[PDB]
Amino acid sequence: ALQLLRDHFSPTKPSYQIYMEIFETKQSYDEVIDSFICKQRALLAKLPEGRHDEETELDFIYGLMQPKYRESIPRHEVKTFRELLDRGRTVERTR
Amino acid sequence: KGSFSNCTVRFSGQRDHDAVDEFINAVETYKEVEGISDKDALKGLPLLFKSIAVVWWKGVRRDAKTWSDALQLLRDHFSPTKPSYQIYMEIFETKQSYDEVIDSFICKQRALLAKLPEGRHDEETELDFIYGLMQPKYRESIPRHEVKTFRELLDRGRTVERTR
Amino acid sequence: KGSFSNCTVRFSGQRDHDAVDEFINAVETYKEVEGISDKDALKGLPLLFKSIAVVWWKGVRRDAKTWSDALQLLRDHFSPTKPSYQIYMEIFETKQSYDEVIDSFICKQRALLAKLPEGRHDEETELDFIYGLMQPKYRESIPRHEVKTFRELLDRGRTVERTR
Amino acid sequence: KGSFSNCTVRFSGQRDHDAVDEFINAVETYKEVEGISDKDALKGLPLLFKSIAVVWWKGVRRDAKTWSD
């Protein structure tokens, strides 16, 4: 009954809709990085598991961000997904 | 039995320090009052999150294995846990204005000062900052070194408030 | 080798803490270096005053009997030993303006923090009281909880100053 | 023959390389000419400061232990 409730309403939409959706919205200005990375991970977790390593997700998040963050955070500094938020919140607090 | 059925206090992630601090305080007092054990509280946690935050709990659930680390994560992801230096540069930030009741000012100052670490400031030290920031409607007739206890400031301020 | 013959440092009566403390420390240091006895040092004290203060010494000559009493009396009649709340209001009034060196700000603020009663503050809250008034030219790079002592703040301030 | 009694050259805090290097070289030269020991030279060092720098020496007194330091 739980699977029957899941099957009709949230139908596990295919891959190309998700891949076209993760690029249909950039990061608007004066928006905090926490809700952005939360919505991006929640939309990216619909993919088949085991199809993406840890390295491939980070490049997409970096490309998506506003130029408030890209000029002070360059690529190859961060590897794990937590250090991006760790180096973002300091620049946010400094403003 | 029964643990964390429902209550009025629910959390929604509104990015402000006051709401998250009141939520953490209310949950922390409810945990000691009702007698909910430590290991059983982690299972009944997503009954409170009915907001954008229930999407957030699906992402970072595996980082927490104890109640204390989960509470610290809920604090860390939403509230920047302001240090002492911003508090000290924010206390003298504003002064006292005209036509303001002294009790609201003293309540605001003590509520903004009680977030400091306990045991570093005794009773003599705190009085100096409040006396320095007093509106000169109060400082002309109430000088320093006449008051010792913290009640004496309010008890001598109410008479000057009544005298008008 | 003599006993207060002639020297450059004299005292006038300028009514400030810095000049009085400098004159007293220089005289106290000279007495220790040259090696003069306590009874011989008090006879040569009007050889240093040159101003209003010598008229002050023509009147209060019969109150001094030892060297320590005369030094404490000179500290008492001129240095007014300001209370605590004026100091705590004086620290938070003037922020660090742009284009000013770190070392002048740090030495002036340390000389202002020395006026409090001794033993009331540690080193950590001392640095926490000073970390809230610096320019954003220095606060963008070095964060809190990384600088533990009062020397490493200058050690990392001189690096950012050279970099520009 | 004495130990830093009084002299014309003093230091203020002018924040420049030339004045600081001149003052340090003149003091270092005077110590070598007059023949003063290293332990006796550090006790007489506040007899030369006359400015903001004496307030700087009232705070950082406990960091110095030798003459070279």
Query: Is residue C12 a contact partner of residue C53, using CB atoms and an 8 Å limit?
Result: yes
Count of other CB atoms within 10 angstroms of residue B163: 7
Cβ count within 10 A of residue C147: 17
Exposed, middle or buried, C130 (CB in 10 Å: 0-12/13-18/19+)?
buried
Q: How far is CA D42 from CA C17, C36, D5, D19, in A?
A: 25, 19, 13, 21
Name chain D's partners: 3 or more CB pairs within 8 A: C
Cross-chain residue pair A45–B59, CB shorter than 8 Å: yes
- Nearest partner of C113 among C147, C79, C80, C90, judged by Cα: C90
Of residues A41, A51, A36, A50, the one with CA closest to residue A92? A36
CB contact under 8 A, A32 and B52: no
* Neighbour tally for B94: CB within 10 Å: 9
Residue C144 near chain B (CB below 8 Å): yes
Residue C84 and residue B128: Cβ atoms within 8 Å?
yes
Give A32's contacts in chain B (Cβ within 8 Å). Answer: 15
Question: DSSP strand E in chain A: where?
Answer: none
Q: Is the dihedral of CA C103, C109, C115, C116 positive or negative?
A: negative
Q: Which residues of A touch C143 (CB under 8 A)?
A: 90
Resolution (A): 3.9
How many CA within 13 A on the CB side of residue B12? Answer: 7
- Give the Cα separation of A28 and A57 in Å (integer): 20
Determine the Cα–Cα distance for residues C6 and C17; give it in Å rounded to an integer.
Answer: 24
Q: Quick one: residue B122, left, alpha or beta (phi over 0 = left, psi -120 to 50 = alpha)?
A: beta
Residue corresponding to tokens 């104890």: B66
Nearest to C128 among B88, B129, B132 (CB): B88
Could you tell me the CA-to-CA distances from B46 to B12, C71, C92, C129 in Å, in that order? 12, 72, 45, 41
Whole-number Å distance between alpha carbons of D41 and B5: 78
Q: Give the residue from D69, D56, D43 showing the smallest Cα distance to D15.
A: D56
Spatial separation of the C-alpha atoms in residues B76 and B60, rounded to whole Å = 12
Residues in chain B, overall count: 164
Q: Label residue B99 left, alpha or beta by phi (over 0 means left) and psi (-120 to 50 means alpha).
A: left
Total Cβ atoms within 10 A of residue A87: 14
Is the Cβ pair C132, B83 closer than 8 Å? no
Q: How was this structure determined?
A: cryo-EM
Q: How far apart are CA A94 and CA B125, in angstroms?
A: 31
Give the count of beta carbons closer than 10 Å to the beta carbon of residue C131.
21
CA distance B63 to B50: 21
Q: D46 at the C interface (CB within 8 A)?
A: yes
